[PDB]
Amino acid sequence: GSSGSSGTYDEYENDLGITAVALYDYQAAGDDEISFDPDDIITNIEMIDDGWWRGVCKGRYGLFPANYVELRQSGPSSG
């Protein structure tokens, strides 16, 4: 049993998809690429290139190296 500040209704729509956390500060070489700070949170992460991805950060969707970021993941009791 759990609860919190649900609200007046629980019929919302949140499609964030995949998320990741930056490891180091990056500077999008150009417009195509996006610039995000280290230890930041990114949503709508689309897996395109094993080395580069595309997600919506601080209101910006562009190409970015998956090396300067880590795929969010937790390890609970029952893996």
Curated annotation (Swiss-Prot):
Residues 15-73 form the SH3 domain. Phosphorylated by PKN2 at both serine and threonine residues in a GTP-bound Rac1-dependent manner in hyaluronan-induced astrocytes and hence down-regulated CTTN ability to associates with filamentous actin. Phosphorylated on tyrosine residues in response to CHRM1 activation. Phosphorylated by PTK2/FAK1 in response to cell adhesion. Phosphorylated by FER. Tyrosine phosphorylation in transformed cells may contribute to cellular growth regulation and transformation. Phosphorylated in response to FGR activation. Phosphorylation by SRC promotes MYLK binding. The modification Phosphotyrosine is found at Y9, Y12. It comes from the Eukaryota. Signal peptide: none annotated. It is found in: Cytoplasm, Cytoskeleton; Cell projection, Lamellipodium; Cell projection, Ruffle; Cell projection, Dendrite. The SH3 motif may mediate binding to the cytoskeleton. Contributes to the organization of the actin cytoskeleton and cell shape. Plays a role in the formation of lamellipodia and in cell migration. Plays a role in the regulation of neuron morphology, axon growth and formation of neuronal growth cones. Through its interaction with CTTNBP2, involved in the regulation of neuronal spine density. Plays a role in focal adhesion assembly and turnover. In complex with ABL1 and MYLK regulates cortical actin-based cytoskeletal rearrangement critical to sphingosine 1-phosphate (S1P)-mediated endothelial cell (EC) barrier enhancement. Part of a complex composed of NEDD9, AURKA and CTTN; within the complex NEDD9 acts as a scaffold protein and is required for complex formation. Interacts (via N-terminus) with NEDD9. Identified in a complex containing FGFR4, NCAM1, CDH2, PLCG1, FRS2, SRC, SHC1, GAP43 and CTTN. Forms a complex made of ABL1 and MYLK. Interacts with SHANK2 and SHANK3 (via its SH3 domain). Interacts with FGD1. Interacts with ABL2. Interacts with KCNA2 (via non-phosphorylated C-terminus). Interacts with PLXDC2 and SRCIN1. Interacts with SAMSN1 (via SH3 domain). This is Src substrate cortactin. The gene is CTTN.
